[PDB]
Design an enzyme around this catalytic site. Structure first.
Site, mmCIF file in Angstrom:
data_model
loop_
_atom_site.group_PDB
_atom_site.id
_atom_site.type_symbol
_atom_site.label_atom_id
_atom_site.label_comp_id
_atom_site.label_asym_id
_atom_site.label_seq_id
_atom_site.Cartn_x
_atom_site.Cartn_y
_atom_site.Cartn_z
ATOM 1 C CG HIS A 1 -2.014 -1.076 1.027
ATOM 2 N ND1 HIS A 1 -2.096 -2.130 1.879
ATOM 3 C CD2 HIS A 1 -3.008 -1.230 0.122
ATOM 4 C CE1 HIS A 1 -3.119 -2.894 1.544
ATOM 5 N NE2 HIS A 1 -3.703 -2.366 0.450
ATOM 6 C CG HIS B 1 -1.854 -0.343 -4.258
ATOM 7 N ND1 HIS B 1 -2.305 -1.485 -4.877
ATOM 8 C CD2 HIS B 1 -2.926 0.216 -3.663
ATOM 9 C CE1 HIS B 1 -3.584 -1.632 -4.635
ATOM 10 N NE2 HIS B 1 -3.982 -0.608 -3.890
ATOM 11 C CG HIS C 1 -7.485 3.821 -3.622
ATOM 12 N ND1 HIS C 1 -6.440 3.790 -4.538
ATOM 13 C CD2 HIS C 1 -7.533 2.607 -3.025
ATOM 14 C CE1 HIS C 1 -5.896 2.591 -4.500
ATOM 15 N NE2 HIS C 1 -6.547 1.845 -3.578
ATOM 16 C CG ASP C 2 -5.113 2.073 -0.470
ATOM 17 O OD1 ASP C 2 -6.060 1.838 0.326
ATOM 18 O OD2 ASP C 2 -4.779 1.313 -1.379
ATOM 19 C CG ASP D 1 -8.079 -1.493 -3.872
ATOM 20 O OD1 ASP D 1 -6.908 -1.155 -4.014
ATOM 21 O OD2 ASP D 1 -8.662 -1.553 -2.770
#
Ligand code: K1Q
Ligand code: MG
Ligand code: ZN
Length: 332
Positions: free
Chosen positions: A84, A88, A124-125, A237
């Site tokens: 992550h 990624h 998104h992370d 994802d």
């Protein structure tokens, strides 16, 4: 958040990605990080090129300069962990590009929704630590207490959205500054709904809602768009098993290490360690990936391709071939 410098933009703008088709479903990102001694600068450039070549930022009054400020503000907030990390979310950005443009999912969304999805890929992370939601709750860590007291179990996903909103409140890095009224609202509401949908505890319910909507000719159009955006970010994802076997194999090694580290901390911390986070169980990757293909990814991609996204058939083909390659690793 301090601003991005001329030094930093130049660091990215000078990278020329020789013999690399960022728009291609076989585009290798692991070999692109071994073609320069500045893998971060390369990744930013892939993201930049992806975003410009879509032709979307320009249509929504997002300058080349703002767009690159945004990417570099994002990259700053990712961490040196096995999976992550920034690689990624650049991967998810590039993969979402292929589903949209090679899989023709763009036909289902507005240009603004396509622009939002490629941007949401990168946020998104944000500031992921290599620990799942569960870890934070079982250890009664501050973030877990806040989520539980707050009434939201998506510990990490809410964190990600908090930082995303931070980055976009500064006009120098607000890729949505060119929007107003309903469009600006939609860009924020859909970026957030999408990030919140990446929580795998909601996996079954997000998938069943999208399939129920696709089968219903009379579904609210707005709600179908939203659930398509969420399914596409979710697709990106868990796209590792849709890639060429060696790329897929590499992703799995990185994610297995991240799981293992969590389970090392959960031990010294004295909390419940599940089989997949336990090193000394030394479970075979082959069996892991076959498990992941059988219970999560194959059913997911098969159902969305059948329901609606026929253009993305190749994902189901590669999952099938990847599975067979792991079965061959077993058979020998
Ligand atoms: C390239 O591979 C993978 C990419 C992603 C994930 C994720 N799994 N999840 C949840 C399904 C537990 C997450 O929440 C993560 C965070 C957000 C999205 C997806 C992420 C697992 C893998 C894998 C693998 C592997 O080899 N054995 C792991 C153990 C395993 C065995 C059987 C079935 C499922 C399973 F996870
Ligand atoms: Mg996540
Ligand atoms: Zn992710």
């Amino acid at each position: 958040v301090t601003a991005i410098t001329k030094v930093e933009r130049e660091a990215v703008l000078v990278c020329e990605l020789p013999s690399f088709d960022v728009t291609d479903v076989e585009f290798d990102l692991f070999r692109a990080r071994e073609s320069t001694d500045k893998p971060l600068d390369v990744a930013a450039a892939i993201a930049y090129r992806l975003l410009l070549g879509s032709g979307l930022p320009q249509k929504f009054g997002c300058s080349d300069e703002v767009l690159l400020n945004f990417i570099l503000q994002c990259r700053k907030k990712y961490r040196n962990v096995p999976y992550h990390n920034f690689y990624h979310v650049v991967d998810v950005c590039q993969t979402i590009h292929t589903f949209l443009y090679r899989g023709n999912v763009y036909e289902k969304l507005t240009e603004l929704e396509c622009f939002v999805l490629l941007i949401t890929a990168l946020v998104h992370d944000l500031d992921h630590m290599g620990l799942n939601n569960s870890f934070y709750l079982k250890t009664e860590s501050p973030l877990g207490i806040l989520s539980s007291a707050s009434g939201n179990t998506s510990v990490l996903e809410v964190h990600h959205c908090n930082l995303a909103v931070e980055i976009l409140s500064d006009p120098e890095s607000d890729v949505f500054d060119g929007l107003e009224g309903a469009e600006r609202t939609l860009a924020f509401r859909s970026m957030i709904d999408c990030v919140l949908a990446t929580d795998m505890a909601k996996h079954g319910s997000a998938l069943e809602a999208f399939l129920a909507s696709a089968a219903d000719q009379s579904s609210d159009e707005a709600a179908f768009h939203r659930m398509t955006m969420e399914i596409i970010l979710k697709a990106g994802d868990i796209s590792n098993v849709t890639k060429p076997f060696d790329i897929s194999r590499q992703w799995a090694m990185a994610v297995t290490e991240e799981f293992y580290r969590q389970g090392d901390m959960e031990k010294e911390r004295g909390v419940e360690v599940l089989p997949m986070f336990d090193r000394s169980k030394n479970m075979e990757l082959a069996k892991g990936q076959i498990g992941f293909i059988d219970f999560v990814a194959a059913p997911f991609f098969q159902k969305i391709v059948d329901a609606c996204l026929q253009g993305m058939q190749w994902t189901v083909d590669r999952i099938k071939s990847n599975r067979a390659q792991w079965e061959r690793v077993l058979e020998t």
